[PDB]
Amino acid sequence: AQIGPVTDLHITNANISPDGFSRPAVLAGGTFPGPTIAGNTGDNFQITVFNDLTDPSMLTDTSIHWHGLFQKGTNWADGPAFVTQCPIITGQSFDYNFNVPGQAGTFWYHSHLSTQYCDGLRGPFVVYDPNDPNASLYDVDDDTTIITLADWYHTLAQQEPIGAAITADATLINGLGRSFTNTTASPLSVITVQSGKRYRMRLVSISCDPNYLFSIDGHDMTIIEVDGVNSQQLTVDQIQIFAAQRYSFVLNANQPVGNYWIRAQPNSGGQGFDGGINSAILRYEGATVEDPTTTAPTTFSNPLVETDLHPLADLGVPGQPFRGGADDPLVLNLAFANGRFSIDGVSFVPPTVPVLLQILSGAQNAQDLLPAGSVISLPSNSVIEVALPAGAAGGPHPFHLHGHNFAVVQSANNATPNYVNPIWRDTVSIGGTGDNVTIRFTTNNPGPWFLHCHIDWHLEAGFAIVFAEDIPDTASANPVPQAWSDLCPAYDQAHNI
Numbered sequence: 001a002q003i004g005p006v007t008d009l010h011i012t013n014a015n016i017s018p019d020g021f022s023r024p025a026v027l028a029g030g031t032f033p034g035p036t037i038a039g040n041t042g043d044n045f046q047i048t049v050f051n052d053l054t055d056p057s058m059l060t061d062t063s064i065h066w067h068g069l070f071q072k073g074t075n076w077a078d079g080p081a082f083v084t085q086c087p088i089i090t091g092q093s094f095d096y097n098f099n100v101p102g103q104a105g106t107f108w109y110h111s112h113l114s115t116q117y118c119d120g121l122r123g124p125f126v127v128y129d130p131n132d133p134n135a136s137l138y139d140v141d142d143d144t145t146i147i148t149l150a151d152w153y154h155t156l157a158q159q160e161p162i163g164a165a166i167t168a169d170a171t172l173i174n175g176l177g178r179s180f181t182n183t184t185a186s187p188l189s190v191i192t193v194q195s196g197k198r199y200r201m202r203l204v205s206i207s208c209d210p211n212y213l214f215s216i217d218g219h220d221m222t223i224i225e226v227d228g229v230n231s232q233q234l235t236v237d238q239i240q241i242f243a244a245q246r247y248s249f250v251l252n253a254n255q256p257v258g259n260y261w262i263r264a265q266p267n268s269g270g271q272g273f274d275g276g277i278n279s280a281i282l283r284y285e286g287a288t289v290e291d292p293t294t295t296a297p298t299t300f301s302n303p304l305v306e307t308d309l310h311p312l313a314d315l316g317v318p319g320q321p322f323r324g325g326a327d328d329p330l331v332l333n334l335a336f337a338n339g340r341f342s343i344d345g346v347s348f349v350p351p352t353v354p355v356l357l358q359i360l361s362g363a364q365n366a367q368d369l370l371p372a373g374s375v376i377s378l379p380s381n382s383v384i385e386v387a388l389p390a391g392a393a394g395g396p397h398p399f400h401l402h403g404h405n406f407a408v409v410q411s412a413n414n415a416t417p418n419y420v421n422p423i424w425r426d427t428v429s430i431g432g433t434g435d436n437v438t439i440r441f442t443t444n445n446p447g448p449w450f451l452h453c454h455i456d457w458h459l460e461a462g463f464a465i466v467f468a469e470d471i472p473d474t475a476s477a478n479p480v481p482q483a484w485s486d487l488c489p490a491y492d493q494a495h496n497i
């Protein structure tokens with residue numbers, strides 16, 4: 001069952017064995033992935049998060065981010081530790097009370113403390129539209145049409161050894177899948193469809209790191225939503241989906257009654273499908289209960305290319321139709337060296353006082369904000385452009401901006417900008433060496449918004465900055481509840497800070 005928009009959510013430690021290997025985890029709602037939190041556009045979400053964590057090997061503090069939700073006027077509820085709050089300590093709870101005006105689509109929630117989400121605190125978050133303009137394109141859209149793609153590690157996130165390469169041990173599709181090494185025939189997830197119906201499949205990458213090449217043997221996929229943004233119909237037979245991205249696609253159950261492989265090939269870890277790794281099962285009602293015997297093509301006929309996507313609505317692009325054609329045009333120098341990432345020469349290290357709290361206490365320029373050099377002010381009511389030239393090791397890097405979606409003026413692997421009708425989204429691959437992925441947005445949401453690589457290992461190693469949007473209005477725009485004010489004193493007390 002879906003929970004919300006008003007719900008408790010307990011965060012606990014437990015053992016799980018999603019690929020047949022048992023390890024402890026950090027779980028929301030007792031499961032991996034966590035339960036789907038859902039409501040309708042404009043709803044008031046009240047998610048009372050109960051921190052019941054006791055195992056320090058995966059951190060007993062926590063903080064949860066509602067990825068893609070703009071949090072306008074509720075920056076305090078956004079979740080990134082030491083940006084908008086101090087963590088919740090064990091044995092305490094915290095009510096994330098916010099509204100979702102003007103948004104409808106497929107989102108997710110995750111720990112936003114250290115690399116804790118990798119240890120399991122990740123789940124879908126769906127905001128339905130009772131007047132969805134795409135409603136007539138499908139018949140079924142419910143918890144059974146959500147498809148999550150996850151990387152899973154046998155080594156605990158905090159215990160990944162300094163200076164050894166981090167790769168996953170299994171791909172999990174809806175929480176199940178098989179280990180790349182010492183593979184056991186553990187159970188695979190089954191997605192069931194009825195011959196003749198049409199499904200809104202909500203494809204969610206809850207990855208900590210790899211991108212996936214996602215496909216369904218014998219089927220194609222009609223994209224209708226990208227990171228919350230309704231798109232024109234785009235039919236593809238493969239989707240390369242980066243960490244934290246989402247797509248809705250229409251699946252037409254128009255093949256013979258049967259079993260078909262669902263494929264999610266990560267860019268690192270196990271390659272191929274031997275023993276059923278990287279796989280799930282699409283099963284039609286009435287099919288024999290047995291594995292698919294289908295094969296992938298050698299070459300996909302219509303892979304997704306980002307520049308092919310366009311908004312369903314007339315969203316345009318703010319500013320002027322050339323490079324630098326914005327009120328605040330930025331170009332970020334994104335680098336990696338010696339185990340640390342940096343943005344304009346500064347490696348992000350979370351501050352002791354959360355950025356929001358520093359602003360509410362009276363720090364009123366970005367030069368006064370800690371960490372020094374990590375907080376960049378943005379002016380209100382302005383068109384911002386942010387070029388994100390690739391080249392830093394560990395790519396392709398999926399950059400994400402909290403508090404906003406953005407026009408993708410320039411996409412990976414294509415040097416041509418689009419100032420007319422590019423897709424809008426909230427996480428974008430910045431591509432490869434010599435690319436110049438560029439985003440635009442307007443500043444109508446006062447508060448400190450994180451900008452970072454959504455490969456969690458890279459965020460932990462410093463690949464982030466904070467956009468202090470409209471410092472002068474942050475306080476008036478974001479009144480804070482007493483419970484939020486209480487977080488830092490309790491955290492600092494428990495940690496002897």
Ligand SMILES: *[C@@H]1O[C@H](CO)[C@@H](O[C@@H]2O[C@H](CO)[C@@H](O)[C@H](O)[C@H]2NC(C)=O)[C@H](O)[C@H]1NC(C)=O
Pocket residue numbers: 323324325329331387389434435436438
């Ligand atoms: C990516 O695009 C940005 C502009 O959006 C380029 O920025 C310019 O960089 C040159 C030096 O490299 C400066 O002289 C200009 O002031 C910058 N802004 C402009 C022209 O608008 C940047 O060079 C591009 N990067 C890559 C690697 O292609």
Ligand SMILES: *[C@@H]1O[C@H](CO)[C@@H](O[C@@H]2O[C@H](CO)[C@@H](O)[C@H](O)[C@H]2NC(C)=O)[C@H](O)[C@H]1NC(C)=O
Pocket residue numbers: 305307308414415416417418419
């Ligand atoms: C590279 O990106 C550009 C810009 O998004 C794409 O160019 C557009 O192509 C479409 C489809 O032919 C045209 O309708 C638009 O007028 C083009 N816009 C511009 C600004 O050129 C282009 O197709 C992409 N390249 C590939 C190979 O997909």
Ligand SMILES: [Cu+2]
Pocket residue numbers: 065067068110244454
């Ligand atoms: Cu996220």
Ligand SMILES: [Cu+2]
Pocket residue numbers: 065066067068400401402403
């Ligand atoms: Cu986010």
Ligand SMILES: [Cu+2]
Pocket residue numbers: 394395396397398453454455458459463
């Ligand atoms: Cu990265």
Ligand SMILES: [Cu+2]
Pocket residue numbers: 065080112402450452
């Ligand atoms: Cu974030």
Ligand SMILES: [F-]
Pocket residue numbers: 066067068069070401402403404
């Ligand atoms: F977000």
